[PDB]
Ligand binder design. Structure first.
Ligand code: XVM
Lengths: 99, 99
């Protein structure tokens, strides 16, 4: 599909057997999701943006389905205000910018 | 052009007669540039990111050329970690997401 940018590019994702709304974010190197209790081990990490850094939990080899397209990679979990799909997963679903 | 996301979507921009490098950021509602001098009036504003709020200077109806495409809109100037081109200008240059 093609998504215009008049509004925030929000889509439905599936992760850990749950549906959520997330932002397709070409400005995000990594994928940052709202607080959730994913199983398995994780590594502490900090990521920075406008305003400073937040503490997040890095889970690896996590499957996410974005608009029916499957992707598996690293997902960061922490007190983010919005679910953010970053380039590490956007590349896997064949997402490009076009103008 | 068509831009893949295996690396950061960085492009050259021209604003106030000066060339700079900026990130095409579909997750940003607004355009925010690092500290610089811009002519014309400006009003103090505040914007929030992943790690909190920052104070910016809002410049309205600023000419800015993005990878060869002209836009005239709002540009915020402040302590952002990187120059980011947000949806307010991405829409002007006809940028869409596609997968
Ligand atoms: C509504 C909820 O509350 P809120 O109002 C806004 O919530 C939001 C918070 C973040 C975002 C996404 C963020 N957009 C953003 O900053 O946009 C600003 C300007 O325009 C406005 O539009 C929305 C906010 C304003 C960027 O797309 C991506 N970022 C990097 C970028 C700064 C380049 C370095 S990043 O997230 O930090 C990040 C992600 C993965 C990583 C990483 C860093 O490092 C490695 O992996 C969108 C909405 O904030 C009050 C507390």
């Amino acid at each position: 599909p093609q998504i215009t940018l008049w509004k925030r590019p929000l889509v439905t994702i599936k992760i850990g057997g749950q549906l959520k709304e997330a932002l397709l974010d070409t400005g995000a190197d990594d994928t940052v999701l709202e607080e959730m209790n994913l199983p398995g081990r994780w590594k502490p990490k900090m990521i920075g943006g406008i305003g400073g850094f937040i503490k997040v939990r890095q889970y690896d080899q996590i499957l996410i389905e974005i608009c029916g397209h499957k992707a598996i990679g690293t997902v960061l979990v922490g007190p983010t205000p919005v679910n953010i799909i970053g380039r590490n997963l956007l590349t896997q679903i064949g997402c490009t910018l076009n103008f």
